[PDB]
From Swiss-Prot, chain A:
InterPro entries: Alkyl-DHAP_Synthase, FAD-bd_oxidored_4_C, FAD-bd_PCMH, FAD-bd_PCMH-like_sf, FAD-bd_PCMH_sub1, FAD-linked_Oxase-like_C, Oxid_FAD_bind_N, Vanillyl_alc_oxidase_C-sub2. The record marks 330 as: Important for enzyme activity. It comes from Dictyostelium discoideum. It catalyses: a long chain fatty alcohol + a 1-acylglycerone 3-phosphate = a 1-O-alkylglycerone 3-phosphate + a long-chain fatty acid + H(+). The keyword Thylakoid does not apply. The lineage of its organism: Eukaryota, Amoebozoa, Evosea, Eumycetozoa, Dictyostelia. This is Alkyldihydroxyacetonephosphate synthase. Its main location: other. FAD binds at residues 151-157, 219-225, 232-237, 279-285.
From Swiss-Prot, chain B:
Pathway: Glycerolipid metabolism; ether lipid biosynthesis. Homodimer. The keyword Secreted does not apply. Changing residue 490 to F: Loss of activity. Gene3D superfamilies: FAD-linked oxidase, cap domain/gating helix, Uridine Diphospho-n-acetylenolpyruvylglucosamine Reductase, domain 2, Vanillyl-alcohol Oxidase, Chain A, domain 4. The lineage of its organism: Eukaryota, Amoebozoa, Evosea, Eumycetozoa, Dictyostelia. Disulfide bonds: none annotated. FAD binds at residues 158-164, 226-232, 239-244, 283-289. Keywords: FAD, Flavoprotein, Lipid biosynthesis, Lipid metabolism, Peroxisome, Transferase. Belongs to the FAD-binding oxidoreductase/transferase type 4 family. This is Alkyldihydroxyacetonephosphate synthase. One of its GO terms (biological process) is ether lipid biosynthetic process. GO terms for cellular component: peroxisome.
Amino acid sequence: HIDLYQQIKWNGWGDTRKFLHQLKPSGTIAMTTPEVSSVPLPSLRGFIKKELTPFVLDETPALQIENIHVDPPKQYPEFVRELKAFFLPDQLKDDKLARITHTFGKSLRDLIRVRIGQVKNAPDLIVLPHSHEEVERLVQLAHKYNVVIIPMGGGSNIVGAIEPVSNERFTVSIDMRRMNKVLWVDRREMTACIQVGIMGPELEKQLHKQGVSLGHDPDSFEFSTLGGWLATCSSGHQSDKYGDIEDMAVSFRTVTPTGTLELRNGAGINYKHIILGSEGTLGIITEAVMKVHAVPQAVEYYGFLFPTFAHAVSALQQIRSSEVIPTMIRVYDPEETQLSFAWKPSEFTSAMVKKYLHYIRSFDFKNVCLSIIGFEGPKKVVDFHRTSVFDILSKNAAFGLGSAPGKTWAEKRYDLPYIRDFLLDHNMWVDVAETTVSYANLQTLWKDAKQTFVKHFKDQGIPAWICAHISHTYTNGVCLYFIFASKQNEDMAQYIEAKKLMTDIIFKYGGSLSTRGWINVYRSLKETIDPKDICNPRKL
Amino acid sequence: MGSPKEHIDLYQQIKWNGWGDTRKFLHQLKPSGTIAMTTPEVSSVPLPSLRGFIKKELTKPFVLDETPALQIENIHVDPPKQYPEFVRELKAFFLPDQLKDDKLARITHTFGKSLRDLIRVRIGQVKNAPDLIVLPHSHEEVERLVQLAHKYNVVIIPMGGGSNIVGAIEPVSNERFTVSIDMRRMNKVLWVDRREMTACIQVGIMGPELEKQLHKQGVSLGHDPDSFEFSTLGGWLATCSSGHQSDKYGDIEDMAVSFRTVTPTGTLELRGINYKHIILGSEGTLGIITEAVMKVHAVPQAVEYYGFLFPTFAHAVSALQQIRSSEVIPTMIRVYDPEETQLSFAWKPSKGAVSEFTSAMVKKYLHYIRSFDFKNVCLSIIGFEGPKKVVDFHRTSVFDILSKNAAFGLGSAPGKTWAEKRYDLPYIRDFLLDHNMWVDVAETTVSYANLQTLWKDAKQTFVKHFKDQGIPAWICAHISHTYTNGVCLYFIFASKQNENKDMAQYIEAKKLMTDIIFKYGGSLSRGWINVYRSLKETIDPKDICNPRKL
Ligand SMILES: Cc1cc2nc3c(=O)[nH]c(=O)nc-3n(C[C@H](O)[C@H](O)[C@H](O)COP(=O)(O)OP(=O)(O)OC[C@H]3O[C@@H](n4cnc5c(N)ncnc54)[C@H](O)[C@@H]3O)c2cc1C
Ligand SMILES: Cc1cc2nc3c(=O)[nH]c(=O)nc-3n(C[C@H](O)[C@H](O)[C@H](O)COP(=O)(O)OP(=O)(O)OC[C@H]3O[C@@H](n4cnc5c(N)ncnc54)[C@H](O)[C@@H]3O)c2cc1C
Ligand SMILES: CCCCCCCCCCCCCCCCO
Ligand SMILES: CCCCCCCCCCCCCCCCO
């Protein structure tokens, strides 16, 4: 048995066996996976050279684990004694690696910090429970002994939600990832009871064996957990079809310092909404009953090009107005489109790349935008939705790139965080900001933000690059996501300044960022459920 | 600041011992014995088949034995409590016409519309009336009222339509001075934003007035409980009521974007934890909702509602299951069992507009039951709303599935008139109660495995229980919503009042139905109590907001 904390990079993203790297001396950037070694991505180096400039990649390696200092764990003999009376020794970890991997999430600041060995407060112990009943025991003991507890799923959050902040008390990281089994599937009710430490791909694999699927698909799907999705109410990119995570949740069990809270599968409070989004501050979710659907009979994904971001946006608007909507859509601006096409290492993909070439002779590639559009469901439904959406696309100057079998279209976003580790290894950095903005303000915010970010650095003699995509649309606007990148300097101050620039410009267009009588309400809930404040204290 | 000239309040326009408009009612024409419907728009339209239906089901010459309710001036109500200092403060901010404490005001703010409520008011049994009714005109005025009630330790109970059937507005004790806050003068749409598709609405507004006001601005909400005509937005939010277009427009909780709640410890405003869910369903125990921002939609391009007959309840259930499995569903569906189908067709008026074709569909029903035994024939009403292209696709899909389950089409009728006839049902309960009869209801969600056995067993058991006592009884059912593995099943059951007039006969009928629903795993209507108690003690430290024991 290998634990997931040993399988996922402790100072980067995702599988330890998968990574980008520079082949020397050609300089060709390649991608290695467990299934294939060193596949050349010949267009990628040219892209990085063009954008962020005899081209040399300056190496800025991460510190080796042996060279990182962490203070000794605190001691609490009488509490640890009690743990060891119920838990097996392989369930308790306090080695350097276990401590580091249960300190940090996956934000830029997290990675910068671990990569230079800056480890302020690590947890004193990692516990890996195997069942709901074990969780109940651990939480009861933490409450008795006044021990801070922080539950962890994939540790993929980018908001510091798992960072230990309570150096006065013994603190325990509860790694939920050994609780990773689908307990049952009810094919009449179309529901499934799932242990919430399960990772995304494992969940969809186990469900598929019983002919069903959940369909919750954040961009972190590969390395995040059901329990994390519930505790953060994370967005999914098939939500336009399958619902939001809170709609998918039928019920779940929450272990709290004052007892276990059960939910049932009209008037009164709908109590699940107290725990959904609570980020471990109100107890630990152990098992959830989730609404599932049959594996669809048709799954069809297509690419399209538009001449401008404006055209793509108009198509987005009219699709939503039609009330006949795809399962998934994403629109990439020209910068992200170019990146997508330089992400090329298959018979169907090169055919698409030929179609892009043809298009950009007439339509300037500086302005051309890629859109990926997917449909899932019964054949009759897919056919009606596809024909509706294609009609609207044709009316908005869309150019079909055709299709390939599968969904590897929609799975390209999963690889992005791997490129982030490659930039950080070669004197570069990349961060993100996401906003909701109305249609009236979108195109000015998009153009202004991009122009402002680049010029800020250009004025200082420093290259910088920014792209954006649209993942979701609402009645009168969109969710717009910026990805922006530049060279490292010779402090944390440069990433804080760039974010400030972006945050300011986004506010300038009433883009969304993030007497309150609800504060007293939350304080009531917290003081009642967790009177000793042991559950992920001091978190926003 | 005053109510406009000639304004009369809704508590005076809705029956104080019955349902709905005081001007609308069923009545027996004399000497013919013919049952007729009067409305404020047309008087005494005969329902020539209705008397014979009641005769057949609940029985020599047939006579309706008259059992009138007591007149209002013959009802005793204990004098109201006095709180001079509290009332004098009210008069520095509220007009005399906003404050009421006469018998009519007190009775109409005591009772909802359950059978037990109607039985009690009809016999003058009024044990816990509020002491004062206040009718605020704005959010600011509710804030003032709630601040004063907290300061003076006065019980406050908000009311909308008073249509609830669970006793939710009825004062539970008389220890403290008690105020009913009638929200119904706060009845305006404040704004509509057609770009965002949202509207800000004062929640004292009644269903039809809401849809009317929104329609003027080209939009609609689409929440349609069977009590739509005489219930309020505020009440829908505070009860999480069901609506019969929810298959298209969603539940009230998802229609609610945000709202303002006036509490004894301040006003909670809405924009981690999704806080709206703390107040939704709270039944006035956590404060008063004043104004709500609701998600609305454009008035549909196409609205098409159809009737169909099936040879048996089984055929109809199969069609419903296959419809949901296909994933292409109607905006509304209702399946009526044979007994409710018969009732529907027996209620035909003898008059109609030149633009109305009920006679065409009655005739089709009569021709159909020549080939299919009427004791098994079921009516279904199926409606579609939206863009023409969407309605066309959904209708063709659904109509295909119907033809595979032996459905027989009766055709459309204009707008939602097919679905508007359910609003008339509670007027007949008043007619029954005036003529020595009673009717009650039981609603349950039941699995498909148990649906048809529960339906047959419950109907048989109920009828037999009274037939063995030599008492006539009648029972029907319909299905209003379907789920992955079950349906919402609604029973309507009726019998004679006993010559000795005791509330024990109603609790007994209810117990039989409750018992059997429970046998078949039908739904009925916890460390979370300590959570609630903490919320309550925080929001409402003096326990003035609709105090309950449990
Ligand atoms: C490359 C990348 C892409 C991303 N894409 C998206 C996206 O598309 N949409 C989106 O919303 N977010 C996205 N995120 C953010 C993050 O992945 C999601 O919020 C995810 O829900 C966190 O899941 P996790 O299992 O990794 O949680 P963790 O990071 O381990 O924990 C998150 C919070 O949940 C609490 N928690 C975890 N498990 C439990 C439990 N069982 N009981 C109680 N509390 C618990 C933790 O204490 C913490 O407060 C992205 C992040 C990255 C780095
Ligand atoms: C014939 C009939 C048919 C019905 N059909 C249905 C149906 O199809 N679906 C369904 O779900 N129910 C149905 N009901 C029940 C009832 O109509 C619903 O619960 C409706 O939501 C109640 O609305 P109301 O305005 O009449 O509320 P009221 O009865 O006036 O009050 C209900 C509760 O809400 C609280 N309240 C009211 N306004 C406010 C406010 N502004 N702020 C805070 N609290 C408030 C009250 O104190 C009370 O606790 C039916 C009832 C009848 C009699
Ligand atoms: C010079 C251009 C190179 C292309 C670099 C684009 C890399 C995109 C990396 C994505 C970053 C991971 C996101 C972390 C937070 C998620 O919301
Ligand atoms: C034999 C004829 C009986 C007449 C049929 C009466 C059916 C009318 C149902 C009215 C019930 C409406 C009020 C119920 C209270 C709760 O909702």
